Design an enzyme around this catalytic site. Structure first.
Site, PDB file in Angstrom:
ATOM      1  N   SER A 177      -9.733   4.785  -8.699  1.00  0.00           N
ATOM      2  CA  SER A 177     -10.318   3.988  -7.624  1.00  0.00           C
ATOM      3  C   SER A 177      -9.692   4.581  -6.344  1.00  0.00           C
ATOM      4  O   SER A 177      -8.830   5.455  -6.456  1.00  0.00           O
ATOM      5  CB  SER A 177      -9.989   2.511  -7.766  1.00  0.00           C
ATOM      6  N   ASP A 196      -8.542   3.520  -2.108  1.00  0.00           N
ATOM      7  CA  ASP A 196      -8.301   2.464  -1.131  1.00  0.00           C
ATOM      8  C   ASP A 196      -8.778   2.960   0.219  1.00  0.00           C
ATOM      9  O   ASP A 196      -8.612   4.115   0.520  1.00  0.00           O
ATOM     10  CB  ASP A 196      -6.785   2.147  -0.965  1.00  0.00           C
ATOM     11  N   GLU A 243      -0.118  -0.476   5.350  1.00  0.00           N
ATOM     12  CA  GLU A 243      -1.210   0.068   4.523  1.00  0.00           C
ATOM     13  C   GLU A 243      -1.803   1.362   5.121  1.00  0.00           C
ATOM     14  O   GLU A 243      -2.083   2.323   4.371  1.00  0.00           O
ATOM     15  CB  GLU A 243      -2.317  -0.980   4.479  1.00  0.00           C
ATOM     16  N   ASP A 249      -5.829   5.180 -11.237  1.00  0.00           N
ATOM     17  CA  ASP A 249      -6.871   4.719 -12.159  1.00  0.00           C
ATOM     18  C   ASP A 249      -8.216   5.337 -11.746  1.00  0.00           C
ATOM     19  O   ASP A 249      -9.250   5.062 -12.375  1.00  0.00           O
ATOM     20  CB  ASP A 249      -6.897   3.180 -12.208  1.00  0.00           C
ATOM     21  N   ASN A 301      -9.522  -1.774  -2.023  1.00  0.00           N
ATOM     22  CA  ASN A 301      -9.783  -1.011  -3.239  1.00  0.00           C
ATOM     23  C   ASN A 301     -11.212  -1.059  -3.780  1.00  0.00           C
ATOM     24  O   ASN A 301     -11.829  -2.159  -3.903  1.00  0.00           O
ATOM     25  CB  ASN A 301      -8.830  -1.612  -4.336  1.00  0.00           C
TER      26      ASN A 301
END
Ligand SMILES: [Br-]
Ligand SMILES: [Br-]
Ligand SMILES: [Cl-]
Ligand SMILES: [Cl-]
Ligand SMILES: [Cl-]
Ligand SMILES: [Cl-]
Ligand SMILES: [Cl-]
Ligand SMILES: [Cl-]
Ligand SMILES: [Cl-]
Ligand SMILES: [Cl-]
Ligand SMILES: [Cl-]
Ligand code: NA
Length: 129
Positions: free
Chosen positions: A50, A52, A35, A48, A59
């Site tokens: 958003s 992370d 990640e 979208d 998120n």
């Protein structure tokens, strides 16, 4: 902060992730590796709108507030910046809610695609724990 592998393993253990919801420490280290490459300050924008945040790329759609993700919730009741700190407490505590929500570690697409089913113990091998 950029953690070393074994350093993050020790941190995650101290903060109670080892076998949390049945996921051994190596699953958590592996998820962090893919990640964020162990960088607490990692951020990535999603399609979208958003974002992370942090070592586990949590998120803003569901979990934290960044002030710029319309219609989102903040289930971990934290600003998303909390998830960028050298201190991993907020990332850990929010991750514990995420992994409890029904889909286990499948919430992290990188964990499903790169860690699930593999020899995750390799990530903690060699480490003082
Ligand atoms: Br704790
Ligand atoms: Br503590
Ligand atoms: Cl590594
Ligand atoms: Cl493991
Ligand atoms: Cl989600
Ligand atoms: Cl902006
Ligand atoms: Cl910490
Ligand atoms: Cl510190
Ligand atoms: Cl599960
Ligand atoms: Cl060894
Ligand atoms: Cl080590
Ligand atoms: Na949010």
């Amino acid at each position: 902060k950029v953690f070393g592998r074994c350093e993050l393993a020790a941190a995650m253990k101290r903060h109670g992730l080892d076998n949390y919801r049945g996921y051994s420490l190596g699953n958590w280290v592996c998820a962090a590796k893919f990640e964020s490459n162990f960088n607490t300050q990692a951020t990535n924008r999603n399609t979208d709108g958003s974002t992370d945040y942090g070592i586990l790329q949590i998120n803003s759609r569901w979990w934290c507030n960044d002030g710029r993700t319309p219609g989102s919730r903040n289930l971990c009741n934290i600003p998303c910046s909390a998830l960028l700190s050298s201190d991993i407490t907020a990332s850990v505590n929010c991750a514990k809610k995420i992994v409890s929500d029904g889909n286990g570690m499948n919430a992290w697409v990188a964990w499903r695609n790169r860690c699930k089913g593999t020899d995750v113990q390799a990530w903690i091998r060699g480490c003082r724990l």
